[PDB]
Swiss-Prot record, chain A:
Pfam families with a match to the protein in the record: Ribosomal_L29
Keywords: Ribonucleoprotein, Ribosomal protein, RNA-binding, rRNA-binding
Gene (UniProt): rpmC
Protein name: Large ribosomal subunit protein uL29
rRNA-binding among keywords: yes
Cellular component, GO, one term: cytoplasm
Entry similarity comment: Belongs to the universal ribosomal protein uL29 family.
Record GO terms (molecular function): rRNA binding; structural constituent of ribosome
Keyword Cell membrane among record annotations: no
Job of this protein: Binds 23S rRNA. It is not essential for growth.
Organism: Escherichia coli (strain K12)
Gene3D superfamilies in alphabetical order: 6.10.140.1970
Subunit organization: Part of the 50s ribosomal subunit. Contacts protein L23, trigger factor and protein nascent chains. Might also contact SecE and probably does contact SecG when the SecYEG translocation complex is docked with the ribosome.
From Swiss-Prot, chain B:
Example of a GO biological process term: cytoplasmic translation
Gene3D superfamilies cross-referenced by the UniProt entry: 1.10.287.3980
Protein family per UniProt: Belongs to the bacterial ribosomal protein bL34 family.
Gene (name only): rpmH
Protein name: Large ribosomal subunit protein bL34
From Swiss-Prot, chain C:
Subunit and interaction comment: Part of the 50S ribosomal subunit. Contacts protein L29 and trigger factor. Might also contact SecE and probably does contact SecG and SecY when the SecYEG translocation complex is docked with the ribosome.
Role, per record: One of the early assembly proteins, it binds 23S rRNA; is essential for growth. One of the proteins that surround the polypeptide exit tunnel on the outside of the subunit. Acts as the docking site for trigger factor for Ffh binding to the ribosome (SRP54) and to nascent polypeptide chains.
Record key words, sorted: Ribonucleoprotein, Ribosomal protein, RNA-binding, rRNA-binding
InterPro entries cross-referenced by the UniProt entry: Nucleotide-bd_a/b_plait_sf, Ribosomal_uL23-like, Ribosomal_uL23/eL15/eS24_sf, Ribosomal_uL23_CS
PROSITE patterns xref list: RIBOSOMAL_L23 (PS00050)
Gene that this sequence comes from: rplW
Protein name: Large ribosomal subunit protein uL23
Recorded family membership: Belongs to the universal ribosomal protein uL23 family.
GO cellular component, one term: cytosolic large ribosomal subunit
Gene Ontology MF terms in the entry: rRNA binding; structural constituent of ribosome
Effect of E18A: Binds normally to ribosomes; strongly reduces trigger factor binding
From Swiss-Prot, chain E:
Matching Pfam families: Ribosomal_L28
Lineage: Bacteria, Pseudomonadati, Pseudomonadota, Gammaproteobacteria, Enterobacterales
Protein name as catalogued: Large ribosomal subunit protein bL28
GO biological process, one term: cytoplasmic translation
TM helices/strands, residue ranges: none
Gene Ontology MF: a single term: structural constituent of ribosome
RNA sequence: GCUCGCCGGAAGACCAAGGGUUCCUGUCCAACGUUAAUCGGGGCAGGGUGAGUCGACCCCUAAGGCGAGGCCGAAAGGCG
RNA sequence: UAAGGUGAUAUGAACCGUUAUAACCGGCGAUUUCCGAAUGGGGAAACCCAGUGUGUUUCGACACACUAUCAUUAACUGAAUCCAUAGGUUAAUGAGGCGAACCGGGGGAACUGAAACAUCUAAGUACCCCGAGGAAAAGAAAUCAACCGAGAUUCCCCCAGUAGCGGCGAGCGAACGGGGAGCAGCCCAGAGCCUGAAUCAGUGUGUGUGUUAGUGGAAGCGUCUGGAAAGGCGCGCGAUACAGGGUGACAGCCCCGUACACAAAAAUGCACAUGCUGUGAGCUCGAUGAGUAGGGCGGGACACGUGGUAUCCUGUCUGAAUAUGGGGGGACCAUCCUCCAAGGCUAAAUACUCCUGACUGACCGAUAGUGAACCAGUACCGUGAGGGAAAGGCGAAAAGAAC
């Protein structure tokens, strides 16, 4: 949800958006479809968090 | 021998399907009047 | 390789049958569950892109989700797809 | 202004329950409240796997009206009236109930 | 509608009357023809379409109407 | 499950128009079933359905609609 | 503004915040699927098939942004051809689809009113087609007047149901002018000096004022009655403030609210001041509305139907002058007076209301008020356009099936 850094070296924050398509949503959706950890907030950790990052990635130039 | 209408699916679109109406200015009035009546069945081929 | 990473929306659910852990003790081919589009052109490589497991042969079929849900409000039911994938020497997919 | 608040204890002066002590738990739509220790309702509860205390019935809390509730004075077990004013922060007592106008 | 340009012409509605004054509605029309002209600044010979008595008002101004008021708010040649 | 009866160029079995969960299994009877409902073209849940070669589809297209250029009709609309 | 919140049926687990990055309210922005103007190209609406460049790739293929059409302005290349133009191409500017009413130009009935019907009326309505603006239409005189002059346009009340028109039949009906509502006049047919002029549309800044957050701001207690009071009784207290609506039965004073008090991140309507972009003064000397005015006839339009018919429009034949020249002054002539066509733009009084934010009703209360108070334009029916139900109702509290 929260970070202490703001739009420096955005090329690595955009490279985290590649892991978001290769593993992090695959594992989270499969884990929840497996009923594991039993947390309903855990499937709510990508929403409203990644939008803050994708907003700064709409201005990744000058980072 | 037979009564009423034939069940064939191509003649269920080739008179009143979306493009067959949208390509005619009076057929666009069916869409306008149904939006003005609030009717959910805006297409009747299904 | 080849296609976009955004295409890999697949294999996000365990198979619905208790057969999922016995299929490889009967034959060389395991069962998987997929979405409304099973990515037929990518799925034979998607297993390497998600599990690093490779398969010899692939097939996909539809399991029709039925329709009856609420008598009068007629609520949507959604179809699902099932895959049969052949393993040379492995068993965990 | 507000007149009840959750920051300290209150006294109910309303229907079913009057002259009795409590504190706010939660606020509801269009202005109703739930208050600690109110007389509650019997309630069956249709069977569920949740813990529901020994024997039958849950004995469940009920919401109350907010128009006939006051702040509790502690010293003599009565209502208190002072008024509240403060800018840009959490409100502060203004102490005006002194019969000062003409 | 018929292209008339320099004459402003449009279709027009009128009437016919009998000896008992009975009314029969009639329509009037522009009668059109295509003409060849020389203006030199286009290098090519130019071809324009106007209604009757149109050339008799173009020829008043030599080339001025042909290079402006005819084409500029009308049709190309 | 066994008779007896009837169709047998059909009252057998496919292709087509069309229909779409009716297939295999448990469970239920608020409503259906021209008489009971234990049964299901019924209500609720489960199980299974994998083709480049068969049907779409697609390459070539008839009759033909639409139509760049282009030419008509106050105008909806005309023709190619 | 702040201690509340995570839409509802819809509960149950669970989570975010109570101190600044929890919802919430006010402003300004991000991202905005596939189809639809829908725009590579194709199509059965949410479908199918492609290329160029970039990235990499034993070259298959996907991403990334990109590729509809036409006009207008500026230019590069250009078919018969020569010069040109059509096509091709880049930048700029415009058009493209949908909505409630008003409105501009064009098309356009029958039934009906004439106690029948034929000119007249119905009616340039109903309805359709192309399209424009906050309004549109109209305007600063080629108008009327009448020896006395009026004087931009428009809508309301009058002149007037008059002057007049009409198978003189039914019916139709001017203006000029008076009162009142509204109050700035210029350009083009050119270009020189002048040079930002007086002005205006948009916008910023300043202020003043609406509009979109908001916070403060008066007075009633007990007792009996009762399921419960605000009733009764005791008697009180407030007022620049007794409307509307709640709290266990009907409290001015319990609560919401009212009269009253206070202010400016940002956005937007108005007014004055004023920068910025565009447009534009002043002065002098030029220029001056030609297939249409006139001359006839047919028809249409004006209140006015061809009559004792001008005006205004346009179908056709004929067809000017340059100011004592020319239109008009309601057949026609002579004499006088009046205005300057053949080229345009204006603010406001005028028409209308989908819609932003609010306030009320001698307003209805389920056979009434919207088809329509309830997941009603739904069910249901139709080749389809289209048509279109029946079903409103506890309580102080949901305390609802523990068992």
């Amino acid at each position: 949800m929260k970070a202490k850094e703001l739009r420096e070296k955005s090329v690595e924050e955009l490279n985290t958006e590649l892991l978001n398509l290769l593993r992090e949503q695959f594992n989270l959706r499969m884990q929840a479809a497996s009923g594991q950890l039993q947390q309903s907030h855990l499937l709510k950790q990508v929403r409203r968090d990644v939008a803050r990052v994708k907003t700064l990635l709409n201005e990744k130039a000058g980072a | 021998m037979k009564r009423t209408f034939q069940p064939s699916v191509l003649k269920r679109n080739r008179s009143h399907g979306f493009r067959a109406r949208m390509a005619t200015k009076n057929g666009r009035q069916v869409l306008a009047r149904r939006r003005a009546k609030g009717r959910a069945r805006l297409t009747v081929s299904k | 390789m080849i296609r976009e990473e955004r295409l890999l929306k697949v294999l996000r659910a365990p198979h619905v049958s208790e057969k999922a852990s016995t299929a490889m003790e009967k034959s060389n081919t395991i069962v998987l569950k997929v979405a409304k589009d099973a990515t037929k052109a990518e799925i034979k490589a998607a297993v390497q892109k998600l599990f690093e497991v490779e398969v010899e042969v692939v097939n996909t079929l539809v399991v029709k989700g039925k329709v009856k849900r609420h008598g009068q409000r007629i609520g949507r039911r959604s179809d699902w797809k099932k895959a049969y994938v052949t393993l040379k020497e492995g068993q965990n997919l | 202004a507000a007149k009840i608040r959750r920051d300290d204890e209150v006294i109910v002066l309303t229907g079913k329950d009057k002259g009795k002590r409590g504190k706010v738990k939660n606020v509801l739509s269009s202005g109703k409240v739930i208050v600690e220790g109110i007389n509650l309702v019997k309630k069956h509860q249709k069977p569920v796997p949740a813990l529901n205390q020994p024997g039958g019935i849950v004995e469940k809390e009920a919401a109350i009206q907010v128009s006939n509730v006051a702040i509790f004075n502690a010293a003599t077990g009565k209502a208190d009236r002072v008024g509240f004013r403060f800018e840009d922060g959490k409100k502060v007592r203004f102490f005006k109930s002194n019969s000062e106008t003409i | 509608s018929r292209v008339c340009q320099v004459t402003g012409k449009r279709p027009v509605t009128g009437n016919n009357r009998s000896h008992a004054l009975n009314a029969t509605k009639r329509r009037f029309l522009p009668n059109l023809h295509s003409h060849r002209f020389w203006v030199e600044s286009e290098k090519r010979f130019v071809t324009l379409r106007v209604s009757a008595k149109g050339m008799r008002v173009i020829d008043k101004k030599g080339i001025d109407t042909v290079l402006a008021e005819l084409r500029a708010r009308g049709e190309k040649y």
